[PDB]
Write a protein that binds this DNA or RNA. Structure first.
Ligand SMILES: [K+]
Ligand SMILES: [K+]
Ligand SMILES: [K+]
Ligand SMILES: [K+]
Ligand SMILES: [K+]
Ligand SMILES: [K+]
Ligand SMILES: [K+]
Ligand SMILES: [K+]
Ligand SMILES: [K+]
Ligand SMILES: [K+]
Ligand SMILES: [K+]
Ligand SMILES: [K+]
Ligand SMILES: [K+]
Ligand SMILES: [K+]
Ligand SMILES: [Mg+2]
Ligand SMILES: [Mg+2]
Length: 1323
DNA sequence: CAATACCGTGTACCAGCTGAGAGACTCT
DNA sequence: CACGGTATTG
């Protein structure tokens, strides 16, 4: 009675099967609980659990942060009102009340219905004088008269509620008054250097050309046009691009060897400009200085479109400009339409359903939708030239609250705010005392490194307080410890040392950590010369010498440098051979050289006394990102260096963390030697033990202290903390649960083996392509504009990624010829089963790669390596892709053997984690030598094994027929894996978790590893094999080709498979989010307790968490007589907590009385019901049902559908043609299933007519569409499908009355344990 | 209760920690 | 996207 378990782990399924030593699936009687006739049932021990995908926490996180945003914005308004409270009471005692109740209707209003002034005359007068809030903003900024306190509040509140972004550091002081003079000064500074070839700025309207509502690039072309004998890629062209906020590269301008890309907005611009000036000289400094100057004057030309010399509120003035032009253009457009085409006027100005001005202002039409609607109308009319000009600049009839206002920095709003405060503090003293308070309310932002301002009731918070008092925008620095919080922000997330768990790992760029990495690589290098008999380790003295002379003088150390600069220069070796490193050393002393460039003091860095200091500095540069805190923490070392060095140190920041702690690296000492790990790396006699040898050596103390430092998660917690998609972690947890239930099913006997197999955006594509094209300087999107959806075509995506060129040949590709080109695998897919862009390429003909058995040929490499490097720099291909392309100049036979091995050997980390979990759960006992006793072998397989087995022995799978293929996959996994390790017991080292003992031959072996199943094999030449296959040594039978294939065939043909759909309470959003207009419908849900939706509108479409069976009574008629009822009441997500708090009260409040409490059945989604003739239904909600049966199509028809549909060989085609009649029979099957179970008369008859319509079609296509027909019978929700060209729309089960009298089936996870409840016996 | 058709919150920026893949060193 | 909510037509 021994058995094995097969598992197929996916993101929506866990297939499971139990097999004996004869590869048979057992069957058992299982008890059946409940109140029905049936006391037990026969079950095959095979099946599959289905479940809805697990979801990421991301959407939840976005919702949470937006909630915190709304809370804090409301609090901003509340702070402001609190400052205004006393004096507004003197001016208008119900102003803020009218504001808070502005949403209410006039019935529900407690005050007068005009919010600002409280009477109609003054309200109309206000709106006449101030059509938009920006009119009032500009008036309050510019005017000197005392103003109404309510208008002052409204202006400041508008600025504080919509305050703009915080993406620009420092203060901004708009001034565009002398852009022309700054541009002329730039031209003068340039012409100073180049007296031989100056630029004549006379007549160049830089103010207009550069501030035009055009792209930065567009304006570059125009301006260069104004400068004769000057070209856009010359030096002045690049300086103009610089002033415009572009990223020009001055490499060609100065004949540099390295790139000199420069961007003014980048926070690294100062050091980059110093880099460049070190290359070219400080005589050019002024040049870039001048650039900066001009750049400060035109920085915001796009949002500030008004002369800043007339008003101190140029943003509101630009909004007023939008408004005035909207008015003028609307007047003109109305007149033009009235004149030239009156019949359209209504449509344009009255029909909200159309995308006219009506839909633009009152309907749901957007500015883009509106422009698209009205542009043909404009082009048809005459007199619309300037209107079309504004239309094609996205600047016609603009609103003032638009999508593009995200550009506006908070400094602009703050400027207008401070201006209003300065104006009106002359008249209201409280505005003078609270000016900085209001400014702070606008400017204050919770720092990212502080997080929620919690008090011990937030699982997301880490902030610590200096004092226990309420935090406000004004006492934040005093109440909150910014430093401790910034530290905890990073430290709550960083690893501890796996060897010393109570120690934090070092920063990745710590000097100590890089010394460690270097010496660790160095201590395993070996060398020989002529006179040497055998390879020798480097001594301690030799390694110190190499670090000093090579690693501390070059950022990277190449093997050639090691050979010449050391062995020749120091040891006088004319020739030497090196091992332990190839080409160059992986490790390096990057931080050493950075700090050298900064402090310019080699002796300081090399002095060991300073070790700690440097560590701390790097820690501070890694831990903190706020330059002020960096300064605060580094101040204690400001005495050791001068001002300029501290200035450079601040701008020097690092990210990233290592794997080891300082205590492990250079702290713990071996008791006898008294040496740290780094000491042994520096010098260890002639043993040269490295880190792994050092921590595992029993003749040293290190291993003991590691064990002393070592130190209880649950299964759920352990699985949650794995790295992987939540969708697959769900499947992993369900897998472990399934294995537990199966073990219990076998009387708590553990299996011999467990075989596990695990199965294997348009905006990102658009972003990649935009970035690559703008990095390329290409106009390919100008000439061939593309939308993100279109990029889902593989060949077009590859076209855009390749700059429209063949990759194996330096020739342009043609878009319209994409169908004629080839997509080739760089490494051939017979070796590396990689089908991603990283291994694929668009070429005219794949023949041009060279030979199809290897990497693209050397000739192609020689041709194209420069273009490939250009694509790599633009990040249009990856380094992996470039390396695979260029490998011919560097596939050995070892590579191909390894590629096959990896085709068959699972090495994914996540599958290894599933294997670890199962292996640790099964094998818990240790033997007399304290070794683990591996009772259960956990085998892991890739899908190709069972896939090839299916395709070889005609056990074909068609996913669309039903869900059985998951269970069948589990069974085949078990069979193949157990047979495999039975045949070749050595292969355990590769397939069993935890098992380990450490080219043409291994290639042959691993390619033909599965031949032992076959009777005859064609390698190549024909090989014949015996009928009974046995173990090499034991002689145990492993495969009988005369019986075991029949066994697999009978198992795959079993009609009773335990497909279980995991019942799940629904969670998440309460309902659809659309805030719908008011309506008469009880289906409307109030958005606030007192906002009756009949007056105010609200949400509809709530999601049901789970339904509830109620047996009770309802009042009927005017008399209110009671009437016994049994019905399904869906409990929505919003009602759930209330219903669970006290269910009888909830139900009585719903209109049910005398509810039978013990007969209340909670029915989660997908709950299973059986009716008549075995027809099964699943709960989709309280009012809808899903198909609940599986169509067990006979195996012969499955294989027919596979081969006939081309899902080659002559025997297969003759079988397809000989068994053509099968088509009819298949339909018959479907029909007889539907009439019994699906119950969709109209859809079924439409399908039958469609099949009888296309009988004369090729058998291949009729099969390809019979595949689509199974959507009619598929388990789950009804869905639309298409037969050839006809469309069958889903038939929905829109009533749940029938299941109230049917049989409810409570299933365990495997579905073996059932509890059946006859619901007709209730009521 | 049909059959049927419609509908469904979206975008943008900034600061991090983590593992994993891939294909080559060194090792337990 | 998909599939459950809703209103409409009957
Ligand atoms: K019973
Ligand atoms: K966010
Ligand atoms: K009223
Ligand atoms: K020119
Ligand atoms: K609109
Ligand atoms: K015309
Ligand atoms: K609006
Ligand atoms: K290397
Ligand atoms: K940092
Ligand atoms: K292994
Ligand atoms: K729950
Ligand atoms: K959930
Ligand atoms: K969900
Ligand atoms: K269940
Ligand atoms: Mg709220
Ligand atoms: Mg709004």
């Amino acid at each position: 009675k021994k058995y094995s378990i097969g598992l197929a782990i996916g993101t929506n399924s866990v297939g499971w099967a139990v097999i004996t030593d004869e590869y048979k699936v057992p069957s058992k009687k299982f008890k059946v609980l409940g109140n029905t006739d049936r006391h037990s049932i026969k079950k095959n021990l095979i099946g599959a659990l289905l479940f809805d995908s697990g979801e990421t926490a991301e959407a939840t996180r976005l919702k949470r942060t937006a909630r915190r945003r709304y809370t804090r914005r409301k609090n901003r308004i509340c702070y402001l009102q609190e400052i205004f409270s006393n004096e507004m009471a003197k001016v208008d005692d119900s102003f803020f009340h009218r504001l808070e109740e502005s949403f209410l209707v006039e019935e529900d209003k407690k005050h007068e219905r005009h919010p600002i002034f409280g009477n109609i005359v003054d309200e109309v007068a206000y709106h006449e004088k101030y059509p938009t809030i920006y009119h009032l903003r500009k008036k309050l900024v510019d005017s000197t008269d005392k103003a109404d306190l309510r208008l002052i509040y409204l202006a400041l509140a508008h600025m504080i509620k919509f305050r703009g972004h915080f993406l620009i550091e420092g203060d901004l002081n708009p001034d565009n008054s002398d852009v022309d003079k700054l541009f002329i000064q730039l031209v003068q500074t340039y012409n100073q250097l180049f007296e031989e070839n100056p630029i004549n700025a006379s007549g160049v309207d830089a103010k207009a050309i550069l501030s035009a509502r055009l792209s930065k690039s567009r304006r570059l072309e125009n301006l260069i046009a104004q400068l004769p004998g000057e070209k856009k890629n010359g030096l002045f062209g690049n300086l103009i691009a610089l002033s415009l906020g572009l990223t020009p590269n001055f490499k060609s301008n100065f004949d540099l060897a390295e790139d000199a890309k420069l961007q003014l907005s980048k926070d690294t611009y100062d050091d980059d400009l110093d880099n460049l000036l070190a290359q070219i000289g400080d005589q050019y400094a002024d040049l870039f200085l001048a650039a900066k100057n001009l750049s400060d004057a035109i920085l915001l030309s796009d949002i500030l479109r008004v002369n800043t010399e007339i008003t101190k509120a140029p943003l509101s003035a630009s909004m007023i400009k939008r408004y005035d032009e909207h008015h003028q253009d609307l007047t003109l457009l109305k007149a033009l339409v009235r004149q030239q085409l009156p019949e359209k006027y209504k449509e344009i100005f009255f029909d909200q359903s159309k995308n006219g001005y009506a839909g633009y202002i009152d309907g749901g039409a957007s500015q883009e939708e509106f422009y698209k609607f009205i542009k043909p109308i404009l082009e048809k009319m005459d007199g619309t030239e300037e209107l079309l000009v504004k239309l094609n600049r996205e600047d016609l009839l603009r609103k003032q609250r638009t999508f593009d206002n995200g550009s506006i920095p908070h400094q602009i709003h703050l400027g207008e705010l401070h201006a209003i405060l300065r104006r009106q503090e002359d008249f209201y003293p409280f505005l003078k005392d609270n000016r900085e308070k209001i400014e702070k309310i606008l400017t204050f932002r919770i720092p990212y490194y502080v997080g929620p301002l919690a008090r011990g009731n937030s699982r997301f918070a880490w902030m610590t307080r200096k004092s226990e008092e309420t935090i406000t925008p004004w006492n934040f620095e005093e109440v909150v410890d910014k430093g401790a919080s910034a530290q905890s922000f990073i430290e709550r997330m960083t690893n501890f040392d796996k060897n010393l768990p109570n120690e934090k790992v070092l920063p990745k760029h710590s000097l100590l950590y890089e010394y460690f990495t270097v010496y660790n690589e160095l201590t395993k290098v070996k060398y020989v010369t002529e006179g040497m008999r055998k390879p020798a380790f480097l001594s301690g003295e030799q390694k110190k010498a190499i670090v000093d002379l090579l690693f501390k003088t070059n950022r990277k150390v190449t093997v050639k440098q090691l050979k010449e600069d050391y062995f020749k220069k120091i040891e006088c070796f004319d020739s030497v051979e090196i091992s332990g490193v190839e080409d160059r050393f992986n490790a390096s002393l990057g931080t050493y050289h950075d700090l050298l460039k900064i402090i310019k003091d080699k002796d300081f860095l090399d002095n060991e006394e300073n070790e700690d200091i440097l560590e701390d500095i790097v820690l501070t540069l890694t831990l903190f990102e706020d330059r002020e805190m960096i300064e605060e923490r580094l101040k204690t070392y400001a005495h050791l260096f001068d001002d300029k060095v501290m200035k450079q140190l601040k701008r020097r920041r690092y990210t990233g963390w290592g794997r080891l702690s300082r205590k492990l690296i250079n702290g713990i000492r071996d008791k006898q030697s008294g040496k740290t790990i780094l000491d042994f790396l520096k010098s260890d006699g002639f043993a040269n033990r490295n880190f792994m040898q050092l921590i595992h050596d029993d003749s040293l103390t290190f291993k003991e202290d590691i064990q002393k430092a070592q130190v209880g998660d649950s299964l759920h917690e352990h699985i949650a903390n794995l790295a992987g998609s939540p969708a697959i972690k769900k499947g992993i947890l369900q897998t472990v649960k399934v294995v537990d239930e199966l073990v219990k099913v076998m009387g708590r006997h553990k299996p011999e083996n467990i075989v596990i197999e695990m199965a294997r955006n348009s905006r990102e594509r658009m972003k990649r392509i935009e970035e690559g094209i703008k990095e390329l300087g290409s106009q390919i999107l100008k000439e061939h504009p593309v939308e993100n959806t279109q990029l889902q075509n593989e060949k077009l995506y590859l076209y855009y990624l390749q700059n429209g060129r063949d990759m194996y040949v330096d020739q342009e590709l043609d878009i319209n010829r994409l169908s004629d080109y080839d997509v080739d695998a760089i490494v051939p897919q017979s070796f590396l089963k990689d089908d991603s862009i990283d291994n694929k390429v668009l070429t005219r003909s794949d023949k041009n790669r060279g030979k199809s058995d290897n990497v693209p040929s050397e000739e192609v490499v020689k041709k194209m390596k420069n273009y490939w490097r250009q694509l790599l720099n633009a990040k249009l291909i990856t380094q992996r892709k470039f390396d695979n392309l260029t490998k011919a100049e560097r596939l050995s036979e070892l590579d191909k053997a390894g590629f096959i091995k990896r085709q068959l050997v699972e090495t994914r980390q996540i599958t290894k984690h599933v294997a670890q979990i199962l292996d640790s759960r099964m094998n818990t006992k240790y033997d007399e030598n304290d070794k683990l006793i591996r009772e259960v072998k956990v085998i892991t397989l890739k899908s190709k094994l069972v896939s090839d087995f299916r395709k070889d022995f005609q056990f074909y799978k068609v996913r669309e027929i039903n869900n059985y293929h998951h269970a069948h996959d589990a069974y085949l996994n078990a069979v193949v894996g157990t047979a495999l390790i039975k045949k070749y017991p050595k292969l355990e080292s590769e397939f069993v978790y935890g098992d380990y003992k450490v080219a043409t031959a291994k290639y042959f072996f691993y390619s033909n590893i599965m031949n032992f199943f076959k009777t005859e094999i064609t390698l190549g030449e024909i090989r014949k094999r015996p009928l009974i296959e046995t173990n090499g040594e034991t002689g145990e039978i492993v495969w009988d080709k005369g019986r075991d294939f029949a066994t697999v065939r009978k198992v795959l043909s079993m009609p009773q498979v335990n497909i279980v759909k995991k019942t799940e309470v629904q969670t998440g959003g309460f309902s659809k989010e659309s805030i719908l207009p008011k309506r008469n419908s009880d289906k409307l849900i109030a958005r606030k307790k007192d906002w009756d939706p009949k007056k105010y509108g609200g949400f509809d479409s709530p999601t049901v968490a789970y339904s509830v069976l109620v047996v009770a009574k309802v009042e009927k008629g005017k008399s209110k007589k009671l009437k016994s009822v049994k019905e399904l009441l869906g409990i929505t997500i919003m009602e759930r907590s209330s219903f669970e708090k006290n269910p009888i009260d909830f139900l009585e409040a719903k209109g049910y009385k005398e509810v039978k409490k013990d007969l209340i059945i909670k029915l989660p989604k997908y709950s299973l019901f059986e009716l008549e003739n075995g027809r099964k239904r699943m709960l989709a909600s309280a009012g809808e049902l899903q198909k609940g049966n599986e169509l067990a199509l006979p195996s012969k028809y499955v294989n027919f559908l596979y081969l006939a549909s081309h899902y080659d060989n002559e025997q297969k085609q003759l079988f397809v043609e000989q068994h053509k009649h099968y088509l009819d029979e298949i339909i018959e099957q479907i029909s007889e299933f539907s009439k019994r179970v699906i119950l969709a008369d109209a859809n079924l008859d439409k399908v039958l007519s469609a099949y009888n319509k296309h009988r004369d079609k090729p058998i291949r296509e009729q099969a390809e569409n019979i595949i689509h027909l199974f959507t009619l019978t598929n388990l789950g929700a009804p869905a639309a499908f298409k037969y050839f060209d006809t469309t069958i729309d889903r038939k929905r089960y829109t009533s749940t009355k029938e299941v109230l009298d049917a049989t409810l089936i409570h299933q365990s996870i495997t579905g073996l344990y059932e509890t059946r409840i006859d619901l007709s016996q209730l009521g």
